[PDB]
Design a protein around this nucleic acid. Sequence first.
RNA 1: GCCCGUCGCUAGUACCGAUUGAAUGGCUUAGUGAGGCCUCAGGAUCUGCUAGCGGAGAAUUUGGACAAACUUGGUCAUUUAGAGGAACUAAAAGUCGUAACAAGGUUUCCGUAGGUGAACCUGCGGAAGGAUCAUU
RNA 2: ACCCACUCGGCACCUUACGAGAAAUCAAAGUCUUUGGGUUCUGGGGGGAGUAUGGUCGCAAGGCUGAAACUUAAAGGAAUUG
RNA 3: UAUCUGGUUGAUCCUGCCAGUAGUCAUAUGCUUGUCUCAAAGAUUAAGCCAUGCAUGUCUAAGUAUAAGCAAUACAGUGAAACUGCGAAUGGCUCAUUAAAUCAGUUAUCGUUUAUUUGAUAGUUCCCUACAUGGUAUAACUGUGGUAAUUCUAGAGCUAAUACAUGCUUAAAAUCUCAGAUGUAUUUAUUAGAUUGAUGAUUCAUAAUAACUUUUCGAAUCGCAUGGCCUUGUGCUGGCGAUGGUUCAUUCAAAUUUCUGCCCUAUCAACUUUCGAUGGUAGGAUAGUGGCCUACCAUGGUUUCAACGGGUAACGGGGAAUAAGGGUUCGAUUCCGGAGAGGGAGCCUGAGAAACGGCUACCACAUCCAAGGAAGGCAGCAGGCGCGCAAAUUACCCAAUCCUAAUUCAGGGAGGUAGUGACAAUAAAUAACGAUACAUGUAAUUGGAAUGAGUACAAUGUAAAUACCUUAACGAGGAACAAUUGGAGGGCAAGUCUGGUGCCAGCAGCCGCGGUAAUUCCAGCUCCAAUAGCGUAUAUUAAAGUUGUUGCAGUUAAAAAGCUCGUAGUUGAACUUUGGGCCCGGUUGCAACGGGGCCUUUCUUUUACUUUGAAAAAAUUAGAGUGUUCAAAGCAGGCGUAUUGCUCGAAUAUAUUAGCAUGGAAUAAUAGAAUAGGACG
RNA 4: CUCUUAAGGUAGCCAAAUGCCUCGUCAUCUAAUUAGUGACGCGCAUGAAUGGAUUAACGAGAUUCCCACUGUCCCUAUCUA
Lengths: 184, 185, 258
Amino acid sequence: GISRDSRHKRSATGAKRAQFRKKRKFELGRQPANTKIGAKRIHSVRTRGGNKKYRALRIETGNFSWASEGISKKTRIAGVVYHPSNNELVRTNTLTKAAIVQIDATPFRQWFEAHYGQTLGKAERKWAARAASAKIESSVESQFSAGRLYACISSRPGQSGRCDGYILEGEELAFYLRRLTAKK
Amino acid sequence: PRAPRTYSKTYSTPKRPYESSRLDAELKLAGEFGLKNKKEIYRISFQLSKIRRAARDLLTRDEKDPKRLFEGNALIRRLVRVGVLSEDKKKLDYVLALKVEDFLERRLQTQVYKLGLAKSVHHARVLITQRHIAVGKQIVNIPSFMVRLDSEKHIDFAPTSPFGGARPGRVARRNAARKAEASGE
Amino acid sequence: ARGPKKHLKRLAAPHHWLLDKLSGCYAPRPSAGPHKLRESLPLIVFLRNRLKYALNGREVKAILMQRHVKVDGKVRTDTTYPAGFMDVITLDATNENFRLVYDVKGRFAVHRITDEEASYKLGKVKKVQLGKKGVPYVVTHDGRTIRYPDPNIKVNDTVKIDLASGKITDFIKFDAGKLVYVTGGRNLGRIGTIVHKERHDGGFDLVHIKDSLDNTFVTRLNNVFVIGEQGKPYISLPKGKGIKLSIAEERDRRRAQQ
RNA sequence: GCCCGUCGCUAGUACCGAUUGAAUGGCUUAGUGAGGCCUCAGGAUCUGCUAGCGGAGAAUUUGGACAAACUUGGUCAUUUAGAGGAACUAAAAGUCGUAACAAGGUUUCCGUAGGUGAACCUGCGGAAGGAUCAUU
RNA sequence: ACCCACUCGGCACCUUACGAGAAAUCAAAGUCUUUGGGUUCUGGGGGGAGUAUGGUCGCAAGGCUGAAACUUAAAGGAAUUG
RNA sequence: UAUCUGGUUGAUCCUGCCAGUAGUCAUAUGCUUGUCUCAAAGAUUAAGCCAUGCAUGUCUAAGUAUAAGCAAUACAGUGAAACUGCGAAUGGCUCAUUAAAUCAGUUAUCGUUUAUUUGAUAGUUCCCUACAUGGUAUAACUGUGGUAAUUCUAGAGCUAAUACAUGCUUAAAAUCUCAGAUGUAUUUAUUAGAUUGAUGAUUCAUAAUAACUUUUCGAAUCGCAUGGCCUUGUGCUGGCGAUGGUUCAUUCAAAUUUCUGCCCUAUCAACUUUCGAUGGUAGGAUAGUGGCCUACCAUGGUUUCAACGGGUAACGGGGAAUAAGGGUUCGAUUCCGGAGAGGGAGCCUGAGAAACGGCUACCACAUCCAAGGAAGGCAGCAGGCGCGCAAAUUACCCAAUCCUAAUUCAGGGAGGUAGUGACAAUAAAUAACGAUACAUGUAAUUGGAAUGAGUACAAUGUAAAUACCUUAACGAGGAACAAUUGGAGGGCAAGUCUGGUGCCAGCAGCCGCGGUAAUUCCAGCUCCAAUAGCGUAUAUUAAAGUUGUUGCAGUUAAAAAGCUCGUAGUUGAACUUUGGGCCCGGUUGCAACGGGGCCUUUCUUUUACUUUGAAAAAAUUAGAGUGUUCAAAGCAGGCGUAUUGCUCGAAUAUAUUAGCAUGGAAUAAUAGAAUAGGACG
RNA sequence: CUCUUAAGGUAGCCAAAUGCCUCGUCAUCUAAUUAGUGACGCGCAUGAAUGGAUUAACGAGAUUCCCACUGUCCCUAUCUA
Ligand SMILES: [Mg+2]
Ligand SMILES: [Mg+2]
Ligand SMILES: [Mg+2]
Ligand SMILES: [Mg+2]
Ligand SMILES: [Mg+2]
Ligand SMILES: [Mg+2]
Ligand SMILES: [Mg+2]
Ligand SMILES: [Mg+2]
Ligand SMILES: [Mg+2]
Ligand SMILES: [Mg+2]
Ligand SMILES: [Mg+2]
Ligand SMILES: [Mg+2]
Ligand SMILES: [Mg+2]
Ligand SMILES: [Mg+2]
Ligand SMILES: [Mg+2]
Ligand SMILES: [Mg+2]
Ligand SMILES: [Mg+2]
Ligand SMILES: [Mg+2]
Ligand SMILES: [Mg+2]
Ligand SMILES: [Mg+2]
Ligand SMILES: [Mg+2]
Ligand SMILES: [Mg+2]
Ligand SMILES: [Mg+2]
Ligand SMILES: [Mg+2]
Ligand SMILES: [Mg+2]
Ligand SMILES: [Mg+2]
Ligand SMILES: [Mg+2]
Ligand SMILES: [Mg+2]
Ligand SMILES: [Mg+2]
Ligand SMILES: [Mg+2]
Ligand SMILES: [Mg+2]
Ligand SMILES: [Mg+2]
Ligand SMILES: [Mg+2]
Ligand SMILES: [Mg+2]
Ligand SMILES: [Mg+2]
Ligand SMILES: [Mg+2]
């Protein structure tokens, strides 16, 4: 199968290497999961040592963390809008680490209302204790009017079977919005 | 498989096969010590060459060197114990001056003759080969034995081998059985 | 090559076992266990070659099957159980106890000890780590883990192990002027006191040892085993106490019995 | 005395050589491409739960990467056939001449060019390893 | 211009060689078995053979690089006497 | 044991090779072959092809027993088959591929997986069984069959688990959210992790918060004893274990990995990069790092210090032969590492395989067929064919060595034993002693002794043996119980012997002999050399100072480029703290030689080099000790008795490439401060 | 050796668009070849600016073979104007 050895991949001097030690199992590779969206389908791969990997194909929900307040709500993934490695993954809506996706944002809005009560996008003094330092950001909150949050996938869906991630903020959000407005 | 079995040659042939002086000296040694062939002389000269090389390598080292001291003392001890090296020559420089006759003298075939157990070196050879000689309480039927200078006072005939014991032999038995009939009765 | 090896050809066994060359093709492969493969001593070797009690491996197995042998308090019915340094071999039949220590020549000497001190053992602290749930523990030279150690115990220290409760009763620290055993290298089996410890960050730490005869030798930190303070060993030292007499002095001592 | 070459016979060795020669192996463009694996599906019949709804699931099947192998052509390397051609060596009392060694009877030799059955001859420049260490 | 003396550099020469060499001879061909100042190139018995082949240069003649099979007990150097 | 000799000539001295000479665990082969120990052995040509048989199975007390199997109120013992678990990835064989590949030494995993062993470790589980759940499960078994044929299997009826899938009991205490949750496993994000642990160093160990899981773990298991308390009940507690289990550590390992080191070749000088070549970013994949793969981007990476290419009758090393020193050659092969199982490729299970006595396909071979089909992999052990100059039994056994399994028990062509065996190696029979005659020796003038070569009672040896040792009896006079292989011109030890042949037959490594006077052929006699061995062929080593670093030669013997420039390479003028002096002090015999401390204007560039130390597996080598009877060997063994045993050993040195630690600062190189941008406050 | 010429065809080349014999002989090409090509040369009657030999490129020039291709053919049939 796919081999990760350096017996092929000719040497740094350019010399072609002769073939010894016909392909070894401990050097094997496997095919990409190419995680799609919707109708969760996770397969178990028996890996070395008797361990187990989870090839997530067609993942619909993931655990996304705000990271400004530490909520990490489970949400639905809408689609892929940006991918630094290949625009084809955006076109095919392929879930993978570091992919920029859109998430539902309704659990985050509900948590924000039940925690601060400050009408983000439209037990009495707990909100008073969570005092006027409650504005999140003019770019993290403007997405709530549309009910879609830009997030970066942090897990490896083809490796762990999960599609967790975090909501972009600050300079990362500014960079990714600049990329989006440059490519669209 | 099981570990290799170590084995070494015990002799070395001369470089020049047909040197008349060497042939005459070898024949002199073989005649004097009752040797079977030239291979025994070759073996003695090979042992002497090994000893000489060891002593030379030790003598190249500085005096009172630990390795030189230990190994030279051990070699001198072994040579005086076997009686090849005299008691007044424990210097490691008279080891180099050892000769083939010095080793050939400590042979059991030589010692049996020099102790009066045999009339000639060849008589000693056949007597040893025929199990007639015992070194201690042990029969030694090999002429090359290198008596250890303390077994020399113990070289005697065996309790068997009827020159130092009870039985009258094997050919004497048949001779007596024939003489009894030849007598008439 | 496709998996772990299970045979041990003769002439590939550690030379400190002093195995016969032509006894057979194979040597007893030390099973997995506490100490090591090279630094170990199989029970079959200890019983058939060091004590001569058993004549064959079948007889070694017969001895082991009746719970006679005991390593560090447990029966250890394994024919090739890797017994090693400071391990206590006790046989209830023929009741004497041995602490497996290194003689001056680096072999595992037969060192009879008494029951009143076979109870405990010494162990070099290989590592000090925080385990699950924030519980600190120490890993010793014999693969033992001991939870809740003294907060002053560091690496290269020695810990006395009860070996009945399996807990730390006392600990010696690594410092200049402490009695140390050499558990590997050329000086394997020597006993001395620490003179100095050169650090060599990144590389290997070196320690200078001075025996009672004032001989000073340097050795890697990996194979030094603190056994107490000078003149007060926490264990019973072997017959030679790791002196490393020169060959000439050894010959003199051999010839002093005539 | 020693001696050189052509030519002729015998034997052996290697070389050139039309045959777009032949065989073997390596690599490789292109084409086809088994098989397992991952994957898009598919549903025998198998059994549970209230006509429905889940679960296990063979045959089969989409697309992939891994790819043996085959075909085509190219290239490289190694063996090998071949009319004929052209040498070398050995054996030599063969044929022809006598080129060199004496100033070898034209001193020899080198480089180069031409010629001639053959050694060789001749021109040009060079060397003495010359037959001259030498004409104040 | 010439003479005398010295000097540096050069073409050489004569004698003697401590020395070197197989000798002829050599002030280097010496300072080498008492073997090492630095460095480049070339040779490994005589033929086959500076041939075949490949590469490369040339208009060509040819130049540079360059085998092998096979064959042979000598070939050769200096010197001595005839 | 630092050695030469014959051959060019009429004679000489050289160059120079040929030849001789000795060794070879170095292969054949010829002749010969009595004894004891030791034992290589189808590597070379064909990793060519294979008939047949065996080489991997395995059960304890402790997973599952209704064999209609055995035996004298559930079986409770043994135990077929089968299910389950484990192993089958070890071993053994071979060297085909492989030239920076393997491998060796030396590093790293702060870059990973790890069955098993050992140690530690889990009071947190549930949204109407726990005095214990289901078949959704079936094997063996019973019965009916099909096929010519295979370790082919179909339908039907059961039956269990430590198989498969579910599934509670653990209070007590505890902190947050607004009654619930907080164990552990997975994923993500965030925080602490200081100067409240560790490392040289971390985003480490660990802890915490918020959440997330096609959902893990949190014994519905088994044996032997049954004890104690009490409301004597299907009461309640409590032993030793076995097995299983999450995580960590450990061990056995594995996988990558730092640095340095490989034979010949330029009649290979440029190579790699379109189709990944060098690097960056991100992703995928992996157990994990990594162009390992993908997308984008950049144009890089190697090379005369030999890249790249080609060859190897190249697996690498430990090592072997030969060796004054330096070297030369070899290493398929008893150990270590690698690779492969006809050539490839793919893959299942499993911790571990790209496994081949596992599977799938293709290619090439090739087996049985009733022609429908089915089955293959001896470079395992024997054995056969073929190839060749070239290499053994279709034997016995698990007794040793160990290995595997559920495990003391079974299995093992692994291994050991024997058969074959002049591979090689060790010891050393074929005679010794008298009397008499002749001149110590000689002449088949005689005698009494000795022995094993054999054969064999018994015994030891052995798993059964066989052989060895030890021996009852036998078993020498031509002691016929008969030693051979090559020579006798020189090298080179030994005949101008006799007959034969007559440049013939032949010998002759070389020089040469033989053409009617043969010291050389063919023979007889005699003699020589080695000797149970000797000769021959090939290769290799020394000889060879004929490959020369040590250490060659170049005017004429082979060889100085026609000449000069010039890059790489090699080499490169001198100089910088020396010399006084006073002390303390080690080793060999008050003296010598070796260090350190103070002054005398004096208290952290970069290397090479060199000293010492760790390191360089074992085996092998040298070497200590040790009466295998000696010896090759082996690591044994030794010492007083009628023990109820004491004890020495299995050292040491060697690798100096490379890395590591360390002392020194001569030698060789390297840089300081010059438009001062300099050194100390 | 002769006879003999002004010289006696040199370097080359050839059964060639030049060779009668001749479909020369050998090899290759093919199942089969008076064809083609490569050789040989006592060449009826080759040959040196009446130019000899060889030539990259070029050619509606002559010729042989191979691949592809096809009604040229096996073996013809059909359709349109
Ligand atoms: Mg002439
Ligand atoms: Mg003339
Ligand atoms: Mg002339
Ligand atoms: Mg030559
Ligand atoms: Mg001359
Ligand atoms: Mg020779
Ligand atoms: Mg073979
Ligand atoms: Mg193996
Ligand atoms: Mg961490
Ligand atoms: Mg990456
Ligand atoms: Mg090799
Ligand atoms: Mg090979
Ligand atoms: Mg090898
Ligand atoms: Mg081979
Ligand atoms: Mg091996
Ligand atoms: Mg394999
Ligand atoms: Mg085969
Ligand atoms: Mg395979
Ligand atoms: Mg097989
Ligand atoms: Mg196998
Ligand atoms: Mg075999
Ligand atoms: Mg005889
Ligand atoms: Mg006998
Ligand atoms: Mg004769
Ligand atoms: Mg002579
Ligand atoms: Mg020479
Ligand atoms: Mg000349
Ligand atoms: Mg010359
Ligand atoms: Mg230069
Ligand atoms: Mg200088
Ligand atoms: Mg003509
Ligand atoms: Mg013609
Ligand atoms: Mg023609
Ligand atoms: Mg035609
Ligand atoms: Mg004309
Ligand atoms: Mg035109």
